[PDB]
């Protein structure tokens, strides 16, 4: 979070597994693996997206046939905010301790 010292907000981040429509509201998403924080002296907040799949690995690429999203969704909500309007929440992504890639392939990929 990167708002002014007088803006404040709560955010949420659920993870909805595949096989149902993703949530449209935080009340609904509350029933997922969510975690929810608020802006303070500490500006950053990290949250691991859990690995959950019936298989042991999961494809890195989408198939042109499949559109229903096989791995499920992440949804970032905004519970409340306090004179925070127009303030940015910059987001970044990395590997966890246990993230791992496998079977190299040159798939054109520019």
């Amino acid at each position: 979070f990167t708002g002014p010292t007088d803006a404040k907000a709560r955010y949420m981040i659920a993870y909805a597994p595949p096989g149902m429509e993703p949530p449209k509201t935080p009340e609904a998403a509350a029933h997922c693996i969510h975690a929810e924080w608020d802006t303070g002296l500490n500006s950053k907040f990290t949250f691991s997206i859990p690995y959950l799949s019936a298989a042991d690995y999961t494809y890195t690429a989408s198939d042109v046939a499949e559109t229903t999203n096989v791995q499920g969704w992440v949804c970032l909500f905004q519970i409340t905010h306090g004179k925070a309007d127009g303030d940015a929440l910059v987001v970044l992504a990395s590997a966890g301790k246990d993230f791992e890639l496998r079977l190299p392939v040159d798939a054109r990929t520019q």
Binding site: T2, T46, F47, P50, A61, V64, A65, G96, E100
Partner: protein, 186 residues
């Protein structure tokens, strides 16, 4: 896992934070020495070919992946399909040398010649990029040059590769929410 935002200290947050249990990682396939050790097909000049690594197409695996390092080191290993004899002159050798057979020439044999070349550049480490010039990379940064009556296929392979200071690497930019390419299917 809250933390201070500007610090740029690494903050990994395990799934333990919400119950849950970190699993076992195995990362052999994304080891640099491993992933870079494959043959990559460069499009040759008909006759004289400097053996630059930057000649590799920047989209290809070995291409784009080598480009993440700003400095690298490897021994090379070219596999080239040609007519006539193939002649490799070291690094920093007059191009007129490419004619004298005493230089490590390899006589023709079906259906390709495969030979390992030593790192031979006068710098400690080569570079994928060089701000002497804001293409346009010092001529000294090479593995030598090959010549044949006609080189047709030419393939580079990095051995022992070491890599230093990672530069960005970038996927193909999708238009739809998923880059929905057609996956191999039974």
């Amino acid at each position: 896992t809250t933390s201070a935002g500007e610090s740029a200290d690494p903050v990994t947050a395990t799934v333990e934070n919400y119950g849950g249990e970190t699993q076992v990682q195995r990362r052999q396939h994304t080891d640099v020495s491993f992933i870079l050790d494959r043959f990559v097909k460069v499009t040759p000049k008909d006759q004289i070919n400097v053996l630059d690594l930057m000649q590799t197409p920047a989209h290809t695996l070995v291409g784009a992946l080598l480009r993440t390092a700003t400095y690298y080191f490897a021994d090379l290993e070219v596999a080239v399909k040609h007519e006539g004899n193939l002649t490799w002159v070291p690094n920093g050798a007059p191009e007129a040398a490419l004619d004298n057979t005493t230089n490590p020439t390899a006589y023709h044999k079906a259906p390709l010649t495969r030979l390992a070349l030593p790192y031979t550049a006068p710098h400690r480490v080569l570079a994928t990029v060089y701000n002497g010039e804001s293409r346009a990379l010092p001529t000294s940064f090479n593995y030598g040059a090959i010549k044949a009556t006609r080189v047709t296929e030419l393939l580079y392979r990095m051995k022992r590769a070491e890599t230093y200071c990672p530069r960005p690497l970038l996927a193909i930019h999708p238009d739809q929410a998923r880059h929905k390419q057609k996956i191999v299917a039974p």
